Design a protein around this ligand. Structure first.
Ligand SMILES: [Cu+2]
Lengths: 131, 131
């Protein structure tokens, strides 16, 4: 399970240069059918592309009708942050963190690290022994 | 009634004569319903409406009528189907029932109406013959 929360909406208007050259950025999630070499969402050769044309994500999405249920798929997740600069960021800025996670849910039948030697462990009976 | 050499038929009307007038007081305002076209004269607003009756036999018997509306493609700018957003077509709504025909001219679609013979086809365009 993708537990991601720093998912800013794309602030640039639809039809903008930004929105057109980064088709994948308009959604937090884009899922498409797998095909060999579907790696770069903004096209293979990115510099100076106007954003017009069926390539990258726009191409993989197509008319959005292809099946992605129980097949080989590709999951593209858009995450990041929106930076409104403050003097604290200057002249050198302190690290700003971004994170996302993929947790196993229903993958295992019980906590998988239970066989890792505990740092400390006292049983109820053992606690009685110690009196 | 005008007949032309391209096969078109046209009805031209010219309105002339004299305005219907009613009396207007010396200090009476023709208000919003009429115009003071001369001292003490009030020409009231009015409409001149005509009902053209057409009994068609477009290329024979068995005819139909339809409304024709110009429309932008339903697909948006930047989509594989309308990448530059210039796509547009003519939407034909053929009247099946009397009720369907009760229509008005719409500037928004540059509406026109077709009277055609659904029993025949133009060998080139594939559309039925029509006026
Ligand atoms: Cu920044």
């Amino acid at each position: 399970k993708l537990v991601s929360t720093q998912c800013p909406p794309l602030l640039a208007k639809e039809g903008s240069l930004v929105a057109k050259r980064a088709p994948w950025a308009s959604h937090s999630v884009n899922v498409v059918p797998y095909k060999d070499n579907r790696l770069y969402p903004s096209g293979d050769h990115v510099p100076q592309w106007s954003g017009d044309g069926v390539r990258g994500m726009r191409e993989w999405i197509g008319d959005g009708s292809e099946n992605i249920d129980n097949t080989d798929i590709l999951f593209f997740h858009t995450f990041g942050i929106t930076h409104f600069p403050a003097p604290e960021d200057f002249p050198l800025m302190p690290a700003e963190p971004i994170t996302l996670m993929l947790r196993p849910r229903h993958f295992f039948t019980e906590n998988p690290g239970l066989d890792i030697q505990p740092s400390y462990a006292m049983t109820t009976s053992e606690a009685k022994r110690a009196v | 009634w005008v007949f032309m050499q391209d096969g078109a038929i046209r009805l031209d009307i010219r309105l002339t004569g004299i305005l219907n007038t009613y009396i207007l007081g010396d200090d009476e305002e023709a208000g919003p319903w009429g115009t003071r076209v001369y001292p003490n004269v009030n020409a009231h607003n009015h409409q001149h409406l005509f009902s053209l009756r057409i009994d068609p036999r477009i290329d024979g018997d068995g005819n139909s009528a339809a409304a024709c509306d110009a429309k932008s493609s339903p697909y948006p700018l930047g989509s594989p189907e309308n990448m530059y957003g210039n796509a547009f077509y003519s939407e034909k709504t053929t009247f099946k029932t009397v009720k369907d025909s009760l229509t008005n001219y719409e500037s928004a679609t540059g509406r026109s109406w077709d009277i055609f013979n659904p029993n025949k086809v133009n060998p080139y365009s594939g559309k039925p013959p029509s006026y």
